[PDB]
Amino acid sequence: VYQEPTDPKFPQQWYLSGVTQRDLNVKAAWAQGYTGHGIVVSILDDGIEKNHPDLAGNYDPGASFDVNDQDPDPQPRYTQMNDNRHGTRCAGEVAAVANNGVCGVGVAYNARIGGVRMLDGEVTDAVEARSLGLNPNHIHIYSASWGPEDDGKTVDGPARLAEEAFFRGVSQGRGGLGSIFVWASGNGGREHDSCNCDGYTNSIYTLSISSATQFGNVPWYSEACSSTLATTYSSGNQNEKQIVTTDLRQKCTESHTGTSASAPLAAGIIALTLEANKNLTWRDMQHLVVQTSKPAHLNANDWATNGVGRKVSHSYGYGLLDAGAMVALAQNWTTVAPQRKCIIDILTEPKDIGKRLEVRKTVTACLGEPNHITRLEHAQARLTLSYNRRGDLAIHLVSPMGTRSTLLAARPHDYSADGFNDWAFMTTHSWDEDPSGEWVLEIENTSEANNYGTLTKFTLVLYGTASGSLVPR
Ligand SMILES: CC(=O)NC[C@H]1CC[N@H+](Cc2cc(Oc3cnc(N4CC[NH+](CCC(=O)[O-])CC4)nc3)nc(-c3cc(Cl)cc(Cl)c3)c2)CC1
Ligand SMILES: [Ca+2]
Ligand SMILES: [Ca+2]
Ligand SMILES: [Ca+2]
Ligand SMILES: [Cl-]
Ligand code: NA
Ligand code: NA
Ligand code: NA
Ligand code: NA
């Protein structure tokens, strides 16, 4: 009964559907009746060609703004180089019109789509805050494919206004259910970048996404880190297919690439899920992703089983998004209990790092208090330390259930002597575990150099609830 789209380039959208299983299971969500109707997504990028023949029918001025020129119209700036085309490509991934004889289709081909023109100029904290905080009671999902430089030597995150915009978004946005911020984990793979050094993807408020190639491999541009939640397909080598979407100047492209093309596909899957249950909160959406994502046939040398029986990787998080499973589980989902936060200051004195430092601490996770957590969501190790060559450090955190999260891998290009100033390294790998018991922090100098420094603060911050657990996998 469900008729698949007839768009000319739809058969080339290999990642949406097919008889092989190398796809995001989007046609199963469309067949259940979910195509994005009533959901509003906004792309935070270099602008959106609102008059594109495959975007105009779904374009929403209420989901759009131009923060670079301070006006409501996010039309890109046209140049000979076609420099401002990325937002239009991302918009088509989410919501390109279906059955109109043009290009392919979006994952949520009936959703409303807009864009914030924010990257075609100087990106300041105010520019970021005004983009993240745009029309929060109209826009449901924000998709951002970029962040601090992916040079493998930067440590940066949202400054005060942008962090306040995330707080306001998840707390009061979407009628109090919370704005959904979808983020790409980064394109710094060739520079050996480690994505927990990017405070936007490392945030608990962003649902972070990495990439897999068509043949199920970790692409050259992928960044590994413990803050990633899940994966979508994107580009790989020149024998693997790429993303097919709308392009600038009313064109179609078959060569959209990078993790920056994975985040919009996740935003479209999240739009289908929100149509299936409009009452899902920002945390319910992250729980659905953890429970339904699929590791099968994704190749990595770090797949590990966590404390509740789920496989998790630093390259893929919980695995590939599965749109059919997401929309099926959303329908009767019971809203998670309010978020609890348990703060544990670990050190009794500063500790010399040297070649290797291990800090062990047994915690009760706020036993006997309103913030008692027996079911973890995100965990952070907020560290303050000095070190002469930052990139030589590797940091791991082991949970009481034995789950080893790499908080920071060695970054050869990071020569900074600035250390970390209360940097909140985050892991999603212990989701649903009981955080009571022994936690172990390991900081090691991965080089033969006689490096030196001191760890002056280690705060373990646990987020979660004390109810609603599933029987382990
Ligand atoms: C103390 C204080 O005030 N500090 C202020 C700083 C301000 C900076 N931030 C860090 C920071 C930098 C940053 O820089 C970018 C500029 N441009 C591009 N790009 C993408 C490739 N494009 C080409 C694509 C193609 O052609 O294919 C060309 C254009 N990407 C990144 N973008 C962001 C950011 C923020 C949000 Cl919210 C949404 C999105 Cl998306 C991104 C954040 C940290 C705080
Ligand atoms: Ca404008
Ligand atoms: Ca189309
Ligand atoms: Ca990065
Ligand atoms: Cl908080
Ligand atoms: Na910073
Ligand atoms: Na995140
Ligand atoms: Na384990
Ligand atoms: Na325990």
Numbering used by the authors: 109 to 581
The authors write:
Furin is one of the proprotein convertases (PCs), a family of subtilisin-like proteases involved in the maturation of many secreted proteins. PCs are Ca2+-dependent serine endoproteinases harboring a catalytic domain with structural homology to subtilisin. The so-called kexin/furin-like mammalian PC family members (furin, PC1, PC2, PC4, PACE4, PC5/6, and PC7) recognize multibasic substrate sequences and cleave after the common pattern (R/K)Xn(R)↓ (where n = 0, 2, 4, 6; X represents any amino acid; and “↓” marks the scissile peptide bond). The inhibitors induced a substantial conformational rearrangement of the active-site cleft by exposing a central buried tryptophan residue.
To investigate the binding mechanism of the (3,5-dichlorophenyl)pyridine-based inhibitors, we soaked compounds 1–5 into crystals of unliganded furin and solved the X-ray structures of the protease–inhibitor complexes. The displacement of Trp254 by the dichlorophenyl moiety and the interactions of the piperazine and piperidine as described for 1 were also observed for inhibitors 2–4, resulting in very similar binding poses. Accordingly, superpositions of the furin–inhibitor complexes with 1 and 2, 1 and 3, and 1 and 4 revealed very similar Cα root-mean-square deviation (RMSD) values of 0.04, 0.05, and 0.08 Å, respectively. Inhibitors 2, 3, and 4 contain negatively charged 2-methylbutanoic or propanoic acid substituents on the piperazine. Enzyme kinetics revealed similar or even higher potency of these inhibitors compared with 1. Interestingly, we found a well-defined water network that mediates interactions between the carboxylate groups of the inhibitors and positively charged residues of furin’s S1′ region. In contrast, for 3 and 4 one carboxylate oxygen interacts with two water molecules, adopting a favorable planar binding geometry. As the (3,5-dichlorophenyl)pyridine derivatives bind tightly to furin, we used single-cycle kinetic experiments to determine their off-rates. The dissociation of 1 and 3 from furin was slow (koff = (1.8 ± 0.6) × 10–4 s–1 and residence time τ = 92 min for 1; koff = (3.1 ± 2.2) × 10–4 s–1 and τ = 53.7 min for 3; Figure 2C and Table S3). The on-rates of 1 (kon = 4600 ± 2500 M–1 s–1) and 3 (kon = (9.6 ± 2.6) × 104 M–1 s–1) can be considered as slow and are likely to be influenced by a structural rearrangement needed for binding. A comparably high bioavailability of 2, 3, and 4 was reported in a bleomycin-induced lung fibrosis mouse model.
